[PDB]
Amino acid sequence: SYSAKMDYGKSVVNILPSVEMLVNFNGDMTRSSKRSCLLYAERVDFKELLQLRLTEKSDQRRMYITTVDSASFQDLKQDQSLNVSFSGFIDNVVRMLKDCQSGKLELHLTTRDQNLSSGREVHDYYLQFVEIRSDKNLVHLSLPCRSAPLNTVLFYINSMLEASHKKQYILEQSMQQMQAEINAQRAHAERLTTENTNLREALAENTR
């Protein structure tokens, strides 16, 4: 299947550092679940394009992707009566993700209520930012979310693997240039300090 990949190199901007988040899975609390996920939020610098990736921590192959561009954003702006520009939208989204971290908000992943007569749609989920209230819970933003197809998933997990390997290389080489200190400084310490243990005996004969 087809899905937007954020393969834009240096133009990819992390709008928020990747974090672990407790996410709600679906509507009815008797049939729902709360799972530990990993959220990745990034945009493109040269064009209006935002992608939010949600992975289940236990199996990052379980990926849910939300991609909103200019047109999509216009549809969202109309449907949800948003009073912001694309940049202000990004600001709001970031802010709300941080609120979901602090617990001020809750991130939900709701199955879209589908049936045979409503035709067919690409997005089978909604990524919702919900405020728990004592009168009625309030949904601040509802984004069309998709179950990532294998090609895209494989792209992100492969990329993550490569990044992990590069990081391991940087770590082990940052250890390697430092690993000379552990073989030089203790060899300068435990073997050459004996000239001090024997110097006191030299001082002993001329101590009076």
Add this chain to the structure above:
Amino acid sequence: SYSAKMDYGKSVVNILPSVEMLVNFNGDMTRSSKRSCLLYAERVDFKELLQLRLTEKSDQRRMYITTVDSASFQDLKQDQSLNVSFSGFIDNVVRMLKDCQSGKLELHLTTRDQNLSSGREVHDYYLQFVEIRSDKNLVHLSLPCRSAPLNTVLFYINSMLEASHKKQYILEQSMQQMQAEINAQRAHAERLTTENTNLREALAENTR
């Protein structure tokens, strides 16, 4: 898309440590190529099952899998006039892989010559162990190789990522305490040189 996955837990045995290998891609040297690959060789302990995985170093999503079980092994034994048991076969394959490492042998990945009128097959390649000779090159073993389907590739790359994460956590957690330890223990100079620099002067002053 189906392919055998070595998801047999502790029963999975590395018959050979994962290594980098230069592999030949296809027959006619005017249309062939030589690429750096990573070879993974593993078997199951409780049943006769061998899998060789070949990934292109530059992109491990490019995966070629050879899976041999009992029946398959009987077919190879007949067709190639092999005079060994399954265990002895595993021994020979390991030996030959080591020889490919040393340069005594060459590992080829040859496209099977297909056309519309021939019987359709799942395996579109041959993993061949070729001995370069001055009379005529000799092919010691020819295994039916398959181009790994997405599901399987995603399984192995995801697995590799998880293992990589475990390795990173173990590495940096074992590294940080020594990065502080070298900063506490390097002072051993300034800690013992007061006992050294003033005692050299005491010894200079007593026999002055």
